[PDB]
Amino acid sequence: LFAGTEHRAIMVDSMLHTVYRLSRGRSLTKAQRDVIEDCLMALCRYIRPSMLQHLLRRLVFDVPILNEFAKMPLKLLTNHYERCWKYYCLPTGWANFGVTSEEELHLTRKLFWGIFDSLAHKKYDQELYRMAMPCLCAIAGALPPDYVDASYSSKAEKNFDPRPVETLNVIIPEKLDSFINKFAEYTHEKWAFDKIQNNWSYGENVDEELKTHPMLRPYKTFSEKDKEIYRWPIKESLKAMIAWEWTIEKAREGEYNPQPPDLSGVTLSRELQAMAEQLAENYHNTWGRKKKQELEAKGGGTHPLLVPYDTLTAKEKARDREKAQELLKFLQMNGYAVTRLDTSSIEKRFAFGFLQQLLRWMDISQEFIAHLEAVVSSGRVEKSPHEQEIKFFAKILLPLINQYFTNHCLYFLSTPAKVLGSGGHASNKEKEMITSLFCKLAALVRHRVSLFGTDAPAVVNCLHILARSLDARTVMKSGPEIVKAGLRSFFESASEDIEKMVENLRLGKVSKGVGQNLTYTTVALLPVLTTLFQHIAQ
Amino acid sequence: PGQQGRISHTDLVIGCLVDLATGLMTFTANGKESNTFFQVEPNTKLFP
């Protein structure tokens, strides 16, 4: 019955939050917890995807800790994204449910990468790895490979404490005090501008609906207390702005409507926006700083909106980013230049970073498998320091690779001239990356099937999928000699292994190295190479 | 001209008048005569 409650979203979201918070409850028995978890699941199923946005935001801060409480939310997200992947992935969206906003996709990306990094750093826990055996795969399938996030930076964030950096303990420059005074006067100028827009005059008499305290008096007579209490936040903000290693340099030495109207028409450079949203995040960190100074006295009822400035809603984000952009624009106009990485859209894409991390982990795989051959050859150690890396690789990356490149195969094979997928085609660089990953995995498993053991079937299946994904035509015509040489070396090695196997069967050998090559061929090589030939011919 | 506070609590009552014998059409804003006027030929049909 909760399916169509788009008109009581406030109540539905409040109920969802209450049930989740109760799930995270001490003095709570296992049966009670299971009941709460089942209720939350069932509600999430029938509730529309747009409705869950806030819960997804909260989970983005909860789950990455990967504590005991992270089990149920992971399953919740798995099922939600499995059923609503059309909502996020497809541009048209899911029928009758619309499409994703963009902020939802940002949250999804953050959740993906937080879980990925946390699991990589954490030690093997068969329970946790099994709960993420349903894995980040639903998240990735829901996320478009071409999704480019408006904001691309480093969180540098960690119960939850928003802490700015403040130089108040140190003296404050007198030139800076002059700046604060100019800024406060020009803020009063925008304040009279705001009264001119609201069309209500200053009222020296008190009146309830204007609620204009008689203190309303032109700057010629304002009492100090109001002025300096308006000023102190300005002092704090400018001090913090400079404290965050941002150099302020007034270009030239100096000797009624606000002359710089805030004009949204002016396009702002991408760099300059990024600083604007960061300084707005600093304003929101001061906001959460005073809210926390207040709360710590209360000790409970954490104000719900206290969350990352990027995660929270744009409209609330709007005021702070507007103030930041205004202050910046004022600085540049006056000449008070405030100064001190946009990877193009292709680099900003999700698949790009995913493949980058996969290639990095392939390099790590080369490293610790080589160490494994060294140790097994002589001085065997049962410690296996890279145990965590081996487990992460085999358990998480291989199924994730399989699912991702089984779902998004068309995006990599599609070309602008010829498009298989409903929407989007991979960049030549992403095609190069997938080709390099395939060749690297083949080299890694070359003559090491036994060393990989039970993960070898997973390796072979991932290789099949990657082969079906490759666009060899594009990669070979327009691709780096490194990628082309890797693929050629794959072919040469396959040949050589075949000739050695074939002569062994010729019984020039006894028919160990020959047996190990034979099993490698039969298990991995002929299947993968046959698949690649079939895909090429198709 | 009130672009400032463009949203208006008031309601705008536009009146339309036609003389079916002279073919003359005129308009009122809030009881104030507008400058716009139209002249149409006889036997013309017009729908509000």
Coordinates of C-alpha atoms in Angstrom, one line a residue:
Chain A
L1 CA 0.0 0.0 0.0
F2 CA 3.0 2.3 0.3
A3 CA 3.6 2.2 -3.5
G4 CA 1.8 5.4 -4.4
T5 CA 2.7 7.6 -1.4
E6 CA 4.4 10.3 -3.4
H7 CA 2.2 12.9 -1.6
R8 CA 3.2 11.8 1.9
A9 CA 6.9 11.6 1.2
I10 CA 7.8 13.4 4.4
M11 CA 6.0 10.8 6.5
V12 CA 7.4 7.9 4.5
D13 CA 11.0 9.1 4.8
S14 CA 10.5 9.8 8.5
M15 CA 9.2 6.2 9.0
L16 CA 12.1 4.8 7.0
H17 CA 14.6 6.7 9.1
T18 CA 12.9 5.6 12.4
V19 CA 13.0 2.0 11.4
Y20 CA 16.6 2.1 10.3
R21 CA 17.6 3.9 13.5
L22 CA 15.8 1.3 15.5
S23 CA 17.6 -1.4 13.6
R24 CA 20.8 0.3 14.8
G25 CA 19.7 -0.2 18.4
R26 CA 21.4 -1.4 21.5
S27 CA 19.5 -3.6 24.1
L28 CA 17.8 -5.1 21.0
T29 CA 17.5 -8.8 20.6
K30 CA 18.2 -10.8 17.4
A31 CA 14.5 -11.5 16.7
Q32 CA 13.6 -7.9 17.2
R33 CA 16.4 -6.8 14.9
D34 CA 15.3 -9.3 12.2
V35 CA 11.7 -8.1 12.4
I36 CA 12.9 -4.5 11.9
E37 CA 15.2 -5.5 9.0
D38 CA 12.3 -7.4 7.3
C39 CA 10.0 -4.4 7.7
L40 CA 12.6 -2.0 6.2
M41 CA 13.2 -4.4 3.3
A42 CA 9.6 -4.8 2.5
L43 CA 8.9 -1.1 2.6
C44 CA 11.9 -0.4 0.4
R45 CA 10.6 -2.9 -2.2
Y46 CA 7.3 -1.3 -2.7
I47 CA 8.4 2.3 -2.2
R48 CA 9.4 4.2 -5.3
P49 CA 13.2 4.7 -6.0
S50 CA 12.9 8.5 -5.8
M51 CA 11.5 8.2 -2.3
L52 CA 14.5 6.4 -0.9
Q53 CA 17.1 9.1 -1.8
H54 CA 17.5 10.3 1.8
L55 CA 17.9 6.8 3.2
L56 CA 20.5 6.1 0.5
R57 CA 22.3 9.3 1.6
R58 CA 22.4 8.0 5.2
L59 CA 23.6 4.6 4.1
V60 CA 26.4 6.3 2.1
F61 CA 27.7 7.4 5.5
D62 CA 26.9 4.2 7.4
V63 CA 27.8 1.2 5.2
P64 CA 31.4 2.1 4.3
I65 CA 32.5 1.5 7.9
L66 CA 31.9 -2.2 7.2
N67 CA 30.9 -3.0 10.8
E68 CA 28.4 -5.6 12.0
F69 CA 25.6 -3.2 11.2
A70 CA 26.7 -3.1 7.5
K71 CA 25.2 -6.5 6.7
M72 CA 21.5 -5.7 6.3
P73 CA 22.0 -2.4 4.5
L74 CA 24.2 -4.1 2.0
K75 CA 21.4 -6.6 1.2
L76 CA 18.9 -3.8 1.1
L77 CA 21.0 -1.9 -1.5
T78 CA 21.6 -5.1 -3.5
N79 CA 17.9 -5.8 -3.9
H80 CA 17.0 -2.1 -4.5
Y81 CA 19.5 -1.6 -7.2
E82 CA 18.8 -5.1 -8.8
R83 CA 15.1 -4.2 -9.2
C84 CA 15.6 -0.4 -10.0
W85 CA 18.7 -0.6 -12.2
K86 CA 16.6 0.7 -15.1
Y87 CA 15.8 3.8 -13.0
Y88 CA 19.5 4.7 -12.7
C89 CA 21.2 3.2 -15.8
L90 CA 18.8 3.8 -18.7
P91 CA 18.4 7.4 -19.8
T92 CA 14.6 7.0 -20.4
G93 CA 14.5 5.3 -17.0
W94 CA 12.1 2.8 -15.5
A95 CA 8.5 2.9 -16.7
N96 CA 6.2 5.0 -14.5
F97 CA 9.1 5.7 -12.1
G98 CA 11.1 8.2 -14.1
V99 CA 14.8 8.6 -14.1
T100 CA 17.6 9.3 -11.6
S101 CA 18.2 12.9 -10.6
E102 CA 22.0 13.0 -10.7
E103 CA 22.5 13.5 -7.0
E104 CA 21.3 9.9 -6.6
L105 CA 24.0 8.8 -9.1
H106 CA 26.6 10.8 -7.1
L107 CA 25.5 9.0 -3.9
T108 CA 25.7 5.6 -5.8
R109 CA 29.2 6.3 -7.0
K110 CA 30.3 7.4 -3.5
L111 CA 28.8 4.2 -1.9
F112 CA 30.5 2.0 -4.6
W113 CA 33.9 3.5 -4.0
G114 CA 33.6 3.7 -0.3
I115 CA 32.7 0.0 0.0
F116 CA 35.4 -0.9 -2.5
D117 CA 38.2 0.9 -0.7
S118 CA 37.0 -0.2 2.8
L119 CA 36.9 -3.9 1.7
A120 CA 40.3 -3.6 0.0
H121 CA 41.8 -2.3 3.2
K122 CA 40.0 -4.7 5.6
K123 CA 41.1 -8.2 6.3
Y124 CA 39.3 -11.2 4.8
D125 CA 36.0 -12.0 6.6
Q126 CA 34.1 -14.7 4.8
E127 CA 30.8 -13.3 6.1
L128 CA 31.4 -9.7 4.8
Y129 CA 32.9 -10.9 1.5
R130 CA 29.8 -13.1 1.0
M131 CA 27.5 -10.2 1.8
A132 CA 29.3 -8.3 -0.9
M133 CA 29.2 -11.4 -3.1
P134 CA 25.9 -9.9 -4.1
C135 CA 28.6 -7.3 -4.3
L136 CA 28.9 -3.9 -5.7
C137 CA 27.6 -5.5 -8.9
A138 CA 24.1 -4.2 -8.6
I139 CA 25.4 -0.7 -7.8
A140 CA 27.7 -0.8 -10.9
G141 CA 25.0 -2.2 -13.2
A142 CA 22.6 0.6 -12.0
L143 CA 25.3 3.2 -12.6
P144 CA 25.8 4.1 -16.3
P145 CA 29.4 3.5 -17.5
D146 CA 29.3 7.0 -19.0
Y147 CA 28.2 8.8 -15.8
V148 CA 30.3 11.9 -15.2
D149 CA 30.0 13.5 -11.8
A150 CA 29.7 17.3 -11.7
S151 CA 32.0 17.4 -8.7
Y152 CA 35.3 15.4 -8.9
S153 CA 37.5 15.9 -5.8
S154 CA 38.8 14.2 -2.7
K155 CA 36.5 13.8 0.3
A156 CA 39.2 14.1 2.9
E157 CA 36.5 13.2 5.5
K158 CA 36.3 10.7 8.3
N159 CA 30.9 10.2 15.6
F160 CA 30.8 12.7 12.7
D161 CA 32.6 15.9 13.5
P162 CA 32.6 18.8 11.0
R163 CA 35.9 20.7 11.8
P164 CA 37.2 23.8 10.0
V165 CA 40.6 25.3 10.5
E166 CA 40.7 28.7 12.2
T167 CA 43.5 31.2 12.9
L168 CA 41.6 33.2 15.5
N169 CA 44.2 32.3 18.1
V170 CA 46.7 34.2 16.0
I171 CA 46.4 37.9 15.3
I172 CA 44.3 38.9 12.3
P173 CA 45.7 41.3 9.7
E174 CA 44.5 44.9 9.8
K175 CA 44.3 44.8 6.0
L176 CA 42.0 41.8 6.5
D177 CA 40.0 43.7 9.1
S178 CA 39.5 46.4 6.5
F179 CA 38.4 43.7 4.0
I180 CA 35.9 42.4 6.5
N181 CA 34.5 45.9 7.0
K182 CA 34.2 46.5 3.3
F183 CA 32.5 43.1 2.9
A184 CA 30.1 43.9 5.8
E185 CA 29.2 47.3 4.3
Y186 CA 28.6 45.7 0.9
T187 CA 26.6 43.0 2.6
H188 CA 24.4 45.8 4.1
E189 CA 24.3 47.1 0.5
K190 CA 22.9 43.8 -0.8
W191 CA 20.7 44.0 2.3
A192 CA 19.1 47.2 1.1
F193 CA 19.0 45.7 -2.4
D194 CA 17.1 42.8 -0.8
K195 CA 14.6 45.2 0.8
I196 CA 14.2 46.9 -2.6
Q197 CA 13.3 43.5 -4.1
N198 CA 11.0 42.5 -1.2
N199 CA 9.4 46.0 -1.6
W200 CA 9.1 46.7 2.2
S201 CA 10.8 49.8 3.6
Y202 CA 12.8 50.0 6.8
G203 CA 10.4 50.4 9.7
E204 CA 11.4 52.5 12.7
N205 CA 8.1 51.4 14.3
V206 CA 7.6 47.9 15.5
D207 CA 5.0 45.9 13.6
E208 CA 4.3 42.2 14.0
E209 CA 4.1 40.9 10.4
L210 CA 7.2 42.9 9.4
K211 CA 8.5 42.1 12.9
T212 CA 10.9 45.0 12.2
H213 CA 12.5 45.7 15.6
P214 CA 12.7 49.5 15.9
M215 CA 16.5 49.0 15.7
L216 CA 15.9 49.4 11.9
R217 CA 18.0 52.5 11.4
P218 CA 20.2 53.5 8.5
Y219 CA 23.9 52.7 9.0
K220 CA 24.3 56.3 10.3
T221 CA 22.9 55.2 13.7
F222 CA 23.1 51.3 14.1
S223 CA 24.0 50.1 17.5
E224 CA 27.4 48.4 17.6
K225 CA 26.2 45.1 19.1
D226 CA 24.2 44.2 16.0
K227 CA 27.0 45.3 13.7
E228 CA 29.8 43.2 15.4
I229 CA 27.5 40.2 15.8
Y230 CA 26.9 40.3 12.1
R231 CA 30.6 40.8 11.7
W232 CA 32.0 38.0 13.8
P233 CA 30.7 35.3 11.4
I234 CA 32.4 37.3 8.6
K235 CA 35.6 37.3 10.6
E236 CA 35.4 33.6 11.2
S237 CA 34.7 32.9 7.5
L238 CA 37.5 35.0 6.1
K239 CA 40.0 33.7 8.7
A240 CA 39.1 30.1 7.8
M241 CA 39.3 30.9 4.1
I242 CA 42.8 32.1 4.5
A243 CA 43.6 29.3 6.9
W244 CA 42.8 26.7 4.3
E245 CA 46.1 27.6 2.5
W246 CA 44.3 29.9 0.0
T247 CA 46.5 32.8 -0.8
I248 CA 44.7 36.2 -1.0
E249 CA 46.6 38.9 -2.9
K250 CA 45.1 42.3 -3.6
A251 CA 46.5 43.0 -7.1
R252 CA 47.0 46.8 -6.7
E253 CA 47.4 49.1 -3.8
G254 CA 44.5 51.5 -3.1
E255 CA 44.3 55.2 -2.1
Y256 CA 24.6 53.8 -4.9
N257 CA 23.5 50.2 -5.7
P258 CA 26.0 47.4 -5.1
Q259 CA 28.4 48.0 -7.9
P260 CA 28.9 44.2 -8.5
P261 CA 25.4 42.8 -9.1
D262 CA 25.6 39.0 -8.5
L263 CA 25.0 37.8 -12.1
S264 CA 24.4 34.1 -12.6
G265 CA 24.8 34.8 -16.3
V266 CA 28.6 35.0 -15.8
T267 CA 30.0 31.6 -16.5
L268 CA 32.6 30.6 -13.9
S269 CA 35.7 28.5 -14.7
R270 CA 35.5 24.9 -13.5
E271 CA 38.5 25.4 -11.1
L272 CA 36.7 28.5 -9.7
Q273 CA 33.5 26.7 -9.2
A274 CA 35.3 23.9 -7.4
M275 CA 36.8 26.4 -5.0
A276 CA 33.3 27.9 -4.6
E277 CA 31.7 24.7 -3.6
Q278 CA 34.6 23.9 -1.4
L279 CA 34.3 27.3 0.4
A280 CA 30.6 26.6 0.6
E281 CA 31.5 23.3 2.2
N282 CA 33.6 25.3 4.6
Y283 CA 30.7 27.6 5.4
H284 CA 28.7 24.4 6.0
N285 CA 31.5 23.0 8.2
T286 CA 31.3 26.2 10.3
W287 CA 27.5 25.7 10.3
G288 CA 27.9 22.1 11.5
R289 CA 30.7 23.4 13.9
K290 CA 28.4 25.7 15.7
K291 CA 25.5 23.2 15.6
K292 CA 27.8 20.6 17.1
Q293 CA 29.1 23.0 19.8
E294 CA 25.4 23.4 20.7
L295 CA 24.5 19.7 20.4
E296 CA 27.4 18.4 22.5
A297 CA 25.7 20.2 25.3
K298 CA 22.5 18.3 24.4
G299 CA 24.2 15.0 23.6
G300 CA 21.3 13.7 21.5
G301 CA 19.0 14.4 18.6
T302 CA 21.7 15.0 16.0
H303 CA 20.3 17.5 13.6
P304 CA 19.4 15.3 10.6
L305 CA 20.7 17.5 7.9
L306 CA 24.2 17.5 9.3
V307 CA 25.8 15.5 6.5
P308 CA 28.4 16.0 3.7
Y309 CA 27.9 19.2 1.8
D310 CA 28.1 17.2 -1.5
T311 CA 25.7 14.5 -0.3
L312 CA 23.0 16.8 1.0
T313 CA 20.3 18.4 -1.3
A314 CA 21.2 21.0 -3.9
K315 CA 18.6 23.5 -2.7
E316 CA 20.2 23.6 0.8
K317 CA 23.5 23.5 -0.9
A318 CA 22.3 26.5 -3.1
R319 CA 22.5 29.2 -0.4
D320 CA 26.0 28.4 0.7
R321 CA 27.3 28.0 -2.9
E322 CA 25.6 31.2 -3.8
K323 CA 27.4 33.0 -1.0
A324 CA 30.7 31.4 -1.9
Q325 CA 30.4 32.4 -5.6
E326 CA 29.4 35.9 -4.6
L327 CA 32.4 36.3 -2.3
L328 CA 34.8 35.0 -4.9
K329 CA 33.4 37.2 -7.6
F330 CA 33.8 40.2 -5.4
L331 CA 37.4 39.2 -4.7
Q332 CA 38.2 38.9 -8.4
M333 CA 36.4 42.1 -9.4
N334 CA 38.2 44.1 -6.8
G335 CA 41.5 42.4 -7.6
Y336 CA 41.8 40.5 -4.3
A337 CA 42.8 37.4 -6.2
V338 CA 42.2 34.3 -4.1
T339 CA 44.2 31.4 -5.5
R340 CA 45.1 27.8 -4.4
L341 CA 42.3 18.3 -11.2
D342 CA 39.7 18.1 -14.1
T343 CA 40.6 15.1 -15.9
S344 CA 38.4 15.4 -19.0
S345 CA 34.9 13.9 -19.1
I346 CA 36.4 10.6 -20.3
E347 CA 38.6 10.3 -17.2
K348 CA 35.7 11.5 -15.1
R349 CA 33.6 8.6 -16.3
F350 CA 32.9 5.7 -13.9
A351 CA 34.1 2.9 -16.1
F352 CA 37.4 4.8 -16.5
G353 CA 38.2 4.8 -12.8
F354 CA 36.9 1.3 -12.4
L355 CA 39.2 0.0 -15.1
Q356 CA 42.1 2.0 -13.7
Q357 CA 41.7 0.4 -10.3
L358 CA 41.3 -3.1 -12.0
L359 CA 44.6 -2.5 -13.9
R360 CA 46.3 -1.4 -10.7
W361 CA 45.1 -4.6 -9.0
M362 CA 46.4 -6.6 -11.9
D363 CA 49.8 -5.1 -11.4
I364 CA 49.5 -6.0 -7.7
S365 CA 48.6 -9.5 -8.8
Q366 CA 51.7 -9.8 -10.9
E367 CA 53.7 -8.7 -7.9
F368 CA 52.4 -11.1 -5.3
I369 CA 52.1 -14.1 -7.7
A370 CA 55.8 -13.5 -8.5
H371 CA 56.5 -13.5 -4.8
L372 CA 54.4 -16.7 -4.5
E373 CA 56.6 -18.5 -7.1
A374 CA 59.7 -17.3 -5.3
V375 CA 58.5 -18.6 -2.0
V376 CA 57.1 -21.9 -3.2
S377 CA 60.3 -22.5 -5.1
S378 CA 62.4 -22.1 -1.9
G379 CA 61.8 -21.1 1.7
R380 CA 58.1 -21.8 1.9
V381 CA 56.2 -19.6 4.3
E382 CA 52.6 -20.2 5.3
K383 CA 52.1 -16.6 6.3
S384 CA 51.3 -15.4 2.7
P385 CA 51.4 -11.6 3.6
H386 CA 49.4 -10.7 0.5
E387 CA 46.7 -13.1 1.7
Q388 CA 44.3 -10.2 1.9
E389 CA 45.1 -9.1 -1.6
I390 CA 44.7 -12.6 -3.0
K391 CA 41.3 -13.0 -1.3
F392 CA 40.1 -9.6 -2.4
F393 CA 41.2 -10.2 -6.0
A394 CA 39.7 -13.6 -6.4
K395 CA 36.5 -13.2 -4.3
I396 CA 35.4 -9.7 -5.3
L397 CA 37.1 -8.5 -8.4
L398 CA 36.6 -11.5 -10.6
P399 CA 32.8 -11.9 -10.1
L400 CA 32.5 -8.1 -10.3
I401 CA 34.5 -8.0 -13.6
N402 CA 32.3 -10.8 -14.9
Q403 CA 29.0 -9.1 -14.0
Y404 CA 30.1 -5.6 -15.1
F405 CA 31.4 -6.7 -18.5
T406 CA 28.5 -9.1 -19.0
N407 CA 26.0 -6.2 -18.4
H408 CA 27.9 -3.3 -20.1
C409 CA 29.4 -5.3 -23.0
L410 CA 27.6 -3.2 -25.6
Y411 CA 29.0 0.1 -24.3
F412 CA 32.5 -1.1 -25.1
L413 CA 31.7 -2.6 -28.5
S414 CA 29.5 0.3 -29.6
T415 CA 30.8 2.9 -31.9
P416 CA 29.4 6.3 -33.0
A417 CA 28.9 4.9 -36.5
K418 CA 27.3 1.7 -35.2
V419 CA 25.5 1.6 -31.8
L420 CA 24.4 -1.7 -30.2
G421 CA 23.6 -0.2 -26.8
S422 CA 20.5 1.8 -26.0
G423 CA 22.7 4.7 -25.1
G424 CA 26.4 5.5 -25.1
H425 CA 29.6 4.0 -26.6
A426 CA 33.0 3.6 -24.9
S427 CA 35.9 5.8 -25.5
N428 CA 38.9 4.5 -27.4
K429 CA 40.9 4.8 -24.2
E430 CA 38.5 2.7 -22.3
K431 CA 38.6 0.1 -25.1
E432 CA 42.4 0.2 -24.8
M433 CA 42.1 -0.3 -21.0
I434 CA 39.8 -3.3 -21.4
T435 CA 42.1 -4.9 -24.0
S436 CA 45.2 -4.3 -21.7
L437 CA 43.3 -5.9 -18.7
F438 CA 42.4 -8.9 -20.8
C439 CA 46.0 -9.4 -22.0
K440 CA 47.3 -8.9 -18.4
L441 CA 45.0 -11.4 -17.0
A442 CA 45.9 -14.0 -19.7
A443 CA 49.6 -13.4 -18.9
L444 CA 49.0 -13.6 -15.2
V445 CA 47.2 -17.0 -15.5
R446 CA 49.7 -18.2 -18.1
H447 CA 51.2 -21.5 -16.7
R448 CA 49.8 -20.7 -13.2
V449 CA 46.4 -22.3 -13.3
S450 CA 47.3 -24.6 -10.4
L451 CA 48.6 -21.6 -8.4
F452 CA 45.3 -19.9 -8.8
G453 CA 43.5 -23.2 -7.9
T454 CA 39.8 -23.0 -7.5
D455 CA 39.7 -19.4 -8.8
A456 CA 41.0 -20.5 -12.2
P457 CA 37.4 -21.1 -13.6
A458 CA 36.5 -17.6 -12.5
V459 CA 39.6 -16.3 -14.3
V460 CA 38.7 -18.2 -17.5
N461 CA 35.1 -16.9 -17.4
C462 CA 36.3 -13.4 -16.9
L463 CA 38.6 -13.8 -19.9
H464 CA 35.7 -15.1 -22.0
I465 CA 33.6 -12.0 -21.1
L466 CA 36.5 -9.6 -21.7
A467 CA 37.1 -11.2 -25.1
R468 CA 33.5 -10.8 -26.0
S469 CA 33.8 -7.1 -24.8
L470 CA 36.9 -6.2 -26.7
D471 CA 36.9 -3.9 -29.8
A472 CA 40.0 -5.1 -31.4
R473 CA 39.4 -3.3 -34.7
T474 CA 39.4 0.1 -33.0
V475 CA 42.2 -0.8 -30.6
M476 CA 44.5 -2.0 -33.4
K477 CA 43.8 0.8 -35.8
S478 CA 44.1 3.7 -33.3
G479 CA 45.7 2.4 -30.1
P480 CA 49.0 2.6 -28.3
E481 CA 51.8 0.3 -29.4
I482 CA 51.8 -1.0 -25.8
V483 CA 48.2 -2.3 -26.1
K484 CA 48.7 -3.6 -29.6
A485 CA 52.0 -5.4 -28.5
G486 CA 50.2 -6.9 -25.5
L487 CA 47.5 -8.4 -27.8
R488 CA 50.1 -9.6 -30.3
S489 CA 52.1 -11.2 -27.4
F490 CA 49.0 -12.9 -26.3
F491 CA 48.6 -14.5 -29.7
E492 CA 52.3 -15.4 -30.0
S493 CA 52.2 -17.1 -26.5
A494 CA 49.1 -19.0 -27.4
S495 CA 50.8 -20.2 -30.5
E496 CA 54.0 -21.3 -28.7
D497 CA 52.0 -23.1 -26.1
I498 CA 50.1 -24.9 -28.8
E499 CA 53.3 -26.0 -30.6
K500 CA 54.8 -27.3 -27.4
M501 CA 51.6 -29.2 -26.5
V502 CA 51.4 -30.6 -30.0
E503 CA 55.0 -31.9 -30.1
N504 CA 54.5 -33.4 -26.6
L505 CA 51.6 -35.4 -28.0
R506 CA 54.0 -36.3 -30.9
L507 CA 55.6 -38.0 -28.0
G508 CA 59.0 -36.4 -28.5
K509 CA 58.4 -36.0 -24.8
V510 CA 57.3 -38.8 -22.4
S511 CA 53.6 -37.6 -22.4
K512 CA 56.0 -31.4 -14.9
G513 CA 56.3 -28.5 -17.3
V514 CA 54.7 -30.3 -20.2
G515 CA 51.8 -31.5 -18.1
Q516 CA 51.3 -28.1 -16.6
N517 CA 51.3 -26.5 -20.0
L518 CA 48.8 -29.2 -21.2
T519 CA 46.4 -28.4 -18.4
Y520 CA 46.8 -24.7 -18.9
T521 CA 46.0 -25.1 -22.6
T522 CA 43.0 -27.4 -22.2
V523 CA 41.5 -25.5 -19.3
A524 CA 42.1 -21.8 -20.2
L525 CA 43.7 -21.2 -23.5
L526 CA 41.7 -23.1 -26.2
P527 CA 38.4 -21.9 -24.7
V528 CA 39.4 -18.3 -24.4
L529 CA 41.1 -18.2 -27.8
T530 CA 38.1 -20.0 -29.4
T531 CA 35.8 -17.4 -27.8
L532 CA 37.9 -14.5 -29.1
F533 CA 38.0 -16.0 -32.7
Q534 CA 34.2 -16.4 -32.6
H535 CA 33.7 -12.9 -31.4
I536 CA 36.1 -11.5 -34.0
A537 CA 34.3 -13.4 -36.8
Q538 CA 30.9 -12.3 -35.5
Chain B
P1 CA 5.9 47.7 -13.6
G2 CA 6.5 45.5 -10.5
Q3 CA 9.1 43.0 -11.6
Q4 CA 10.4 43.4 -8.1
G5 CA 8.0 41.1 -6.1
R6 CA 6.6 40.1 -9.5
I7 CA 4.2 37.7 -7.8
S8 CA 1.1 39.7 -7.0
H9 CA -1.5 38.8 -4.4
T10 CA -4.1 40.7 -6.5
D11 CA -6.2 39.2 -9.3
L12 CA -6.2 40.7 -12.8
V13 CA -9.6 41.2 -14.4
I14 CA -9.4 41.8 -18.2
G15 CA -12.6 42.9 -19.8
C16 CA -13.5 42.5 -23.4
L17 CA -16.2 44.6 -25.1
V18 CA -17.6 44.3 -28.7
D19 CA -20.1 46.5 -30.5
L20 CA -21.9 44.2 -32.9
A21 CA -23.1 47.1 -35.1
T22 CA -19.8 49.0 -35.7
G23 CA -17.4 46.0 -35.6
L24 CA -15.4 47.6 -32.8
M25 CA -13.6 45.6 -30.1
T26 CA -12.0 47.2 -27.0
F27 CA -10.4 46.1 -23.8
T28 CA -10.2 47.1 -20.1
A29 CA -7.5 46.2 -17.6
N30 CA -9.0 46.8 -14.2
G31 CA -11.7 49.2 -15.3
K32 CA -9.1 51.2 -17.1
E33 CA -9.4 51.4 -20.9
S34 CA -6.6 49.8 -22.8
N35 CA -5.2 51.4 -26.0
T36 CA -5.6 48.2 -28.0
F37 CA -8.7 48.3 -30.3
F38 CA -9.8 46.2 -33.3
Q39 CA -12.1 46.7 -36.2
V40 CA -13.7 43.7 -37.9
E41 CA -16.1 43.3 -40.8
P42 CA -19.8 42.5 -40.5
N43 CA -21.1 39.0 -40.3
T44 CA -17.9 38.0 -38.5
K45 CA -18.1 35.3 -35.8
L46 CA -15.9 35.5 -32.7
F47 CA -15.4 33.1 -29.9
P48 CA -14.2 34.2 -26.4

